[PDB]
Amino acid sequence: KGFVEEMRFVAMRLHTRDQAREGEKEVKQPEEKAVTKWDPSVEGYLKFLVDSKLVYDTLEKIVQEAPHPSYAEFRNTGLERSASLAEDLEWFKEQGYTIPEPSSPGLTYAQYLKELSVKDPQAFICHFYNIYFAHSAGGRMIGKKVAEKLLNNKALEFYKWDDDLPRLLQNVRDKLNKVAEPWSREEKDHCLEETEKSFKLSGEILRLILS
Ligand code: HEM
């Protein structure tokens, strides 16, 4: 039975019920409240977008270099976001905003991903799944609400895909199921146990929006 379903179960229970129907956590950090209650700023959102771009650039470099050969299965999935973020940062530059340097949440996550990618493929796969699949789920609703609050409803490229998203996602889920099928139970469990750290490091990047 498909291992992605196991990763999704763990991810959902780590959401707050404010923010997702299947979430089981209480609101503890900002950002963990329902998005409609957020008070974002453009300054904070730009830090979030720059730090996000650093993480996506890092994930793209890891699957191209493929220090473990299974990572090459995840090249060119259609979910890559670095080009879309570059376009959106240029839109903000054309509007007169300053683009910030990467902040500590993105620098920290990028460094950790590079380390994991070499030493711990099971833990890396947990982050690959949670980072990309978070974005195409709640990330889209964050983008829409932030654009309503601050951008007069501008629809940024970060929230657009060149192909049907349900099919893109399902084909990556089936690739993830295939890379995990030879794993032992212990390797699968090790992957699942990494999910809290992905939520922590991602959450610190999301919190920039509200900073
Ligand atoms: C402000 C924060 C967040 C909100 C509002 C949010 C909201 C949601 C919602 C409403 C869903 C269910 C809809 C769906 O499956 O398409 C979902 C799914 C998901 N979220 Fe989040 N989420 C947040 C943060 C995170 C974080 C930090 C992670 C992990 C780093 C994450 C990982 C996932 C995953 C993996 C799914 C399953 C998506 C799928 O099955 O394709 N989310 N999220």
Residue numbers in the entry: 16 to 226
Paper lines:
In this study, we have determined the high-resolution crystal structure of GmHO-1 complexed with heme at a resolution of 1.06 Å, which is the highest resolution for an HO structure reported to date. We therefore adopted the iron single-wavelength anomalous dispersion (Fe-SAD) method for phase determination and successfully solved the structure with refinement finally up to a resolution of 1.06 Å using SHELXL and COOT. The GmHO-1 structure comprises four 310 helices (residues 45–47, 50–52, 84–89, and 172–174) and eight α-helices designated as α1 (20–29), α2 (57–80), α3 (96–110), α4 (119–134), α5-1 (136–151), α5-2 (153–166), α6 (180–196), and α7 (200–224). The heme molecule bound to GmHO-1 is sandwiched between proximal (α1) and distal (α5) helices with axial ligation from His30 residue, consistent with previous data from electron paramagnetic resonance measurements. New features of the GmHO-1 structure include the shorter α1 helix and an additional irregularly structured region continuing from α1, which has not been observed in any other HO structures. To accommodate this novel irregularly structured region near the heme-binding site, the α7 helix (corresponding to α9 in HmuO or α8 in hHO-1) has become a curvilinear helix. Because the C-terminal α7 helix is curved and becomes a curvilinear helix, the last half of this helix forms an unexpected tunnel, together with the novel irregularly structured region. Although the plant-type HO lacks the conserved Asp and Arg residues for the hydrogen-bonding network observed in hHO-1 and HmuO, it has an alternative hydrogen-bonding network formed by Ala149 and His150. On the proximal side, the imidazole ring of the ligating His30 residue, which is rotated approximately 160°, and the δ-nitrogen form a new hydrogen bond to the carbonyl oxygen of Ala26, whereas the δ-nitrogen of the other HOs forms a hydrogen bond with the side chain of a Glu residue (Glu24 in HmuO and Glu29 in rHO-1 and hHO-1), supporting the plant-type–specific accommodation of heme near the N terminus. Interestingly, the back and side walls of the heme pocket are negatively charged in GmHO-1, whereas the other HOs have positively charged walls.
Heme oxygenase (HO) converts heme to carbon monoxide, biliverdin, and free iron, products that are essential in cellular redox signaling and iron recycling. Although the enzymatic reactions carried out by bacterial, mammalian, and photosynthetic HOs are the same, there is a difference in the electron donor required for the reactions, that is, ferredoxin (Fd) is used by photosynthetic HOs, whereas NADPH–cytochrome P450 reductase (CPR) is used by mammalian HOs. Despite many common enzymatic reactions, the amino acid sequence identity between plant-type and other HOs is exceptionally low (∼19.5%), and amino acids that are catalytically important in mammalian HO are not conserved in plant-type HOs.
